[PDB]
Amino acid sequence: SKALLSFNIESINEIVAYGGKPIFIGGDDLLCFAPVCCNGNNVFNLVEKLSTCFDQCINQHLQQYINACSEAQRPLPSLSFGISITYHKYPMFEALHTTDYLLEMVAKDNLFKYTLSNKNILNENMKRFILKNKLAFSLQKHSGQIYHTA
RNA sequence: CGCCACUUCAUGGAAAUAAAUCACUCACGAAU
Ligand SMILES: [Mn+2]
Known part of the structure; x- marks a missing residue:
């Protein structure tokens, strides 16, 4: 829950930074309206940034789970x-x-x-x-x- | 010193070789 909360907040921040309008970011679900390009960043840069926000939040909050499970064998x-x-x-x-x-x-x-x-x-x-x-x-x-x- | 001519009339090798063999731009636009 903590990781998803942090990801949601940072996702809203990053989407509004790129120039996009969030519609619903909560739980595990996301929908947004973004321009094709905005100030040297294209849409795929925004997608990569949101993905990295997800991995960063999962790392920060679920460090026990990643450190104990995914290394042996488990999809993150x-x-x-x-x-x-x-x-x-x-x-x-x-x-x-x-x-x-x-x-x-x-x-x-x-x-x-x-x-x-x-x-x-x-x-x-x-x-x-x-x-x-x-x-x-x-x-x-x-x-x-x-x-x-x- | 005098006298005097005949003979021979192209064979062999090289007969094309290499580089480039399409390139760039536009790959739909506007109204509806
Ligand atoms: Mn969902």
């Missing part, structure tokens, strides 16, 4: 990011749908899990192959050309 807590860049004259609802798709289906690999679970194939060995710690990024121009990558 992680943060997954979904970024969508669109024209200003674009439907907000569809932009948020795209961001949700990128975060859940792609960045969290919930497409794998959902296709497997809808048909009831989700064995434990197949659950071992679920992937996290991903950056899902998409850009829609004024035309319709999409640049997406993970």
Whole structure:
């Protein structure tokens, strides 16, 4: 709880420093509106800074857990990011749908899990192959050309 | 001293070799 609190506060600070407007930062969840570029920093610099804030807060508060568990064998807590860049004259609802798709289906690999679970194939060995710690990024121009990558 | 001519008329080697084989810019823009 302490680590997530510190991360939330520093995330609001860093987002407003970059030039972005926070919408909801609490618990383990984040949503923000940021420019493509602002004063020599691009959006991916902001994403990297938020990721580093997450690792820094996890280090500061969960030092016992990292020092005792993750070194033997355990994945550290992680943060997954979904970024969508669109024209200003674009439907907000569809932009948020795209961001949700990128975060859940792609960045969290919930497409794998959902296709497997809808048909009831989700064995434990197949659950071992679920992937996290991903950056899902998409850009829609004024035309319709999409640049997406993970 | 006099007298006097015939013969031979291109073979062998080298017959192309190397460097560059597309480069840069624009890869959609504006209105809707
Ligand atoms: Mn959550």
